C-alpha cells in the first residue's frame with residue numbers, strides 16, 4: 001500500500017501515498033515492466049466528473065459543503081440532460097494546472113501553479129484559432145522572458161467536431177526529402193512538412209524554416225497560416241570560444257510549445273490544448289542537434305574541433321556533445337532568452353518532489369524521461385528512485401489527425 | 408500474447424514472446440511502475456517443480472527433450488528430492504545454469520559474451536581457506552595478465568540456511584573506505600561499513616586511499632575468516648590522461664578485474680549464495696560512477712579546477728566537461744596498459760546486436776533500460792533509443808541481504 005522511494009546519494013527516504021489515488025493503467029504488470037516503452041457515455045462521465053469535483057472542492061477546503069453538493073448535482077443534471085457538461089472557469093484553470101502537476105514525464109513541474117490559462121472555449125474557426133495562438137505565442141515569448149501558458153480550445157462532443165492543431169509543436173523547423181536521399185531540415189517533420197505542401201504551403205526549402213500552422217476547427221478541414229515572423233523569437237547558436245561555431249549555421253527557436261496532446265479534465269476531453277514553457281538546454285543541444293535521426297550534427301562539430309574520430313574510445317562524440325550544449329546555453333543566455341541547464345533543472349525537480357511528497361503524499365515521475373540525455377548520473381535525479389503512475393486531470397497522447405480525419 | 412518493442416532511431420520493431428515464460432514478479436502493477444526502484448529455505452513441495460522446469464529447459468537446449476535420458480534424470484531428481492529434500496546438479500547442468508543466469512540478467516549490458524563464460528565448480532569446497540584458494544585461482548585465471556576472461560566460481564548450495572557459504576565482500580577486489588573523525592572519508596565511501604567489519608575481525612588497515620580489501624570468507628555457515636589476496640595477483644592501472652600531464656598527479660588508480668561477489672545464483676530451485684563472477688569493465692563504471700558519484704571518490708571539482716573551468720555557474724557545464732576528460736583518461740590508461748576495457752559506445756552498440764539476435768533466436772531479451780543506458784551521454788548511445796521489456800527468467804542472479812545483517816555468530 002504505502003510505498004517508499006530512496007535517493008541513493010542522500011539516503012533520504014520518502015513515502016508515497018498519492019499513488020493510491022491512481023486511476024489509469026501504466027502498461028506494466030506484475031510480470032513485465034514496460035517502463036521504457038514510449039507509448040504503452042453518460043454513465044462513464046458522471047463518475048469522472050464526480051472524482052474531479054471532489055478533488056476540486058477538497059482543494060478549496062469545501063469538501064462536502066452545500067456548494068460542493070450543489071455543483072455536483074448541477075453537473076449531474078446537466079450530464080443526464082446534455083450528455084456532457086461545461087467546467088466553471090475556476091475548474092478549467094484548476095484542471096489544467098493539475099494536468100501539468102500530474103505530468104510524470106515533465107521535469108519542470110516546480111512551476112506548475114504559475115501556469116497562465118487562456119480559455120479559448122468560445123472559438124469556432126481556424127482563423128479564430130490562429131488569433132488565439134498568435135496571442136499565446138506573444139504572451140508566452142514575452143520578449144525572451146518566457147512565461148508558461150496553455151490555450152484551451154472547445155472540448156470534444158461527438159468526435160466529429162474536434163479542434164486540432166496539426167503541428168506537433170506551435171513552432172518547429174520544416175523537413176524535406178532531397179534527391180540525394182538525405183534529408184533537408186528537420187527529419188522529424190519531413191512528413192508534416194509534406195502535408196502542408198499537400199495543402200498549398202510554399203516551402204522555402206531551407207535548413208531552419210519555421211513551419212506554418214495547420215489548424216482544424218469544429219471538425220472541418222485544416223487551414224494554413226504563417227506565424228508573424230516578428231512573433232517567433234530565434235537564437236543564433238555560437239560558442240563562447242569557437243568562433244568557427246557560428247559558421248555551422250545553427251539556430252533554434254526560443255518557445256517550446258507542445259500542441260499535439262489531449263487534456264482530460266473530469267472526463268471531458270480537450271483535443272486542442274497547446275502549452276508552452278521554456279527549454280532545458282539538453283532538449284536542443286543533445287536531442288534536436290545530436291540525435292542521429294534529427295539534425296545529426298556530431299561529426300561535423302568533432303571535425304571542426306579536430307578530434308580523433310578514428311576510435312570511439314577517444315570519446316570524441318562525448319567531447320563534442322558537451323561543447324555543443326555549452327553553446328546552446330551560452331547563446332540563449334546571451335540573447336536574454338529564458339533557458340535552464342540540466343543541472344539546475346534536475347536540482348529544482350528534486351526540491352519539487354520533496355515539496356510534493358510533503359504536501360501531497362507523492363509525485364508521479366517517469367525516471368526514463370526525467371533523467372537528462374547527457375551526464376545522467378552527475379544530475380541528482382539519476383540517483384532518485386521514482387514511482388510512475390497515472391493521475392487525472394492529465395495530458396495524454398492522441399493519434400496524429402491526418403490518420404483519423406475524414407475530409 | 409505478443410509484445411513489440413521499437414527502436415525509435417531505426418524504426419526496427421521486434422516481437423517478444425519470451426516474456427511468456429516469465430514466472431517471477433517485477434514489482435510493478437497495472438497501476439504503478441517501479442522500474443527505477445533499485446531493489447523492488449525451500450520445501451520439497453516447491454522444489455521439484457522448479458527442478459523440472461529447469462531440467463525441461465536444459466534437455467530442450469541439448470535437443471534431447473523427451474528422451475529416455477531426460478525422463479531418467481527427472482525420475483532421479485524426483486527420488487533424490489523426496490529422499491534428501493534437495494538434489495545435486497550434474498556438471499553439465501551447472502554450466503548451462505550459470506551461463507543462462509548471465510543470459511537472463513536484465514541489468515547486464517555485456518551479455519553478448521554469455522555463452523563464453525568459464526565456470527569453476529567449487530561445490531566440493533568445505534572451508535574458508537578452501538574458498539580463498541578457489542578465489543585466488545579464479546582471479547589469476549580471469550585476470551590473465553590483462554587479457555581478461557569472464558568467469559564464475561560456484562561454491563556449495565544452501566541446505567538448511569544455517570550452513571551458507573558467503574563471500575562477505577561485495578566484489579573480490581575493492582578499495583577500503585575509512586570514516587575520519589572530522590567527517591571526511593578516506594578511500595572509497597561505498598566500502599566503509601565493510602572495512603569496519605574487516606578491521607574488527609583483525610585486519611590491519613594501511614589506511615590509504617586505495618587499499619585493496621582483504622577477503623572475508625564464510626564456509627558452511629561458520630564465522631568468516633580474513634585472507635589477503637596475493638598482491639601479485641591484483642592487477643591495477645595508474646590513471647593518466649593523454650593530453651593533460653597533471654592528471655597522473657591526482658594519484659588515481661583502479662583495479663582491472665570487476666568481480667561481483669555478493670549475489671545469489673538460482674538454478675532449478677537450488678540456491679548458490681556464494682557465486683563470485685567477473686568480466687571486464689565498461690569505462691563509465693569507473694570514470695562516471697566510482698570516480699564522480701558525489702557518494703564515491705567525488706573527484707569532479709578537483710579535476711575541474713586543474714582544467715581551470717568556469718565553476719561559477721552550472722550552465723558553464725564544467726561538470727560535464729570534466730566528466731568527459733576523466734572518462735577519456737580511464738579508457739586511455741587501461742588501453743595503454745593492455746588491460747581489457749570497453750567504452751560505452753562500443754558496449755551499447757554490441758548490446759543492441761546481441762538483443763536483436765536474442766529476439767530472433769530466443770523470442771526476446773529481458774532488459775532493464777534504467778541500468779542498460781550508460782550514466783553519461785545517454786542519448787548518443789543506441790540503447791537510449793531502444794524500447795525494452797523487463798521480466799525475470801530463471802536461472803538468475805538475485806540480490807541477497809548483506810551477511811553481517813543475518814549471520815548467527817558462533818564466536
Ligand code: HEM
Nearest residue numbers: 100103105106107108111148149275276277278279280395
Ligand atoms: C516552464 C518550463 C518547463 C520546463 C523546463 C519543462 C521541461 C520538460 C522536459 C525537459 C520534458 C521532456 C521533453 C522531451 O523530451 O521531449 C517535458 C515533458 C513534458 N512536459 Fe514540461 N516543462 C515545462 C513546461 C510544461 C508545461 C507548461 C506543461 C503543461 C502545462 C508541461 C507538460 C509536460 C508533458 C505532458 C510532458 C511530456 C510530453 C511528451 O510526452 O512528449 N510542461 N517538459
Ligand code: HEM
Nearest residue numbers: 509512514515516517520557558684685686687688689804
Ligand atoms: C564480459 C564483461 C561484462 C561486461 C562488460 C558487463 C557489463 C555490465 C555493466 C556495465 C553492468 C552494470 C554494473 C553497475 O552499474 O554496477 C553489469 C551488471 C550486471 N552484470 Fe555484467 N558484464 C560483464 C560480465 C558479467 C558476467 C560474467 C555476469 C554473470 C556471470 C554478469 C552479470 C551481471 C549482473 C547480474 C548485473 C547486475 C548487477 C547488480 O545488480 O549490481 N556480467 N554488467
Ligand SMILES: C[C@H](O)[C@H](O)[C@H]1CNc2nc(N)[nH]c(=O)c2N1
Nearest residue numbers: 036037038368369791792793794
Ligand atoms: C525508447 C525510450 O523510451 C526513448 O528513447 C525515451 C527515453 N527517454 C526519453 N526522455 C525524454 N525526456 N524524452 C524522450 O523523447 C525520451 N525517449
Ligand SMILES: C[C@H](O)[C@H](O)[C@H]1CNc2nc(N)[nH]c(=O)c2N1
Nearest residue numbers: 382383384385443444445777778
Ligand atoms: C535510483 C536509480 O534506480 C539508481 O540510481 C540506478 C539507475 N541506473 C543505474 N544503472 C546502472 N548501470 N547502475 C546503477 O547502479 C544504476 N543506479
Ligand SMILES: NC(=[NH2+])NCCC[C@H](N)C(=O)O
Nearest residue numbers: 256277278279280283284288
Ligand atoms: N521544455 C519544454 N516545454 N519542452 C517541450 C518539448 C520540446 C522538445 N523536447 C524539443 O526539443 O523541441
Ligand SMILES: NC(=[NH2+])NCCC[C@H](N)C(=O)O
Nearest residue numbers: 665686687688689692693697
Ligand atoms: N563490468 C562488470 N563486470 N561490472 C561489475 C560491477 C562493477 C562496479 N560497477 C564497479 O564500478 O566496480
Ligand SMILES: [Zn+2]
Nearest residue numbers: 028033435440
Ligand atoms: Zn514498470
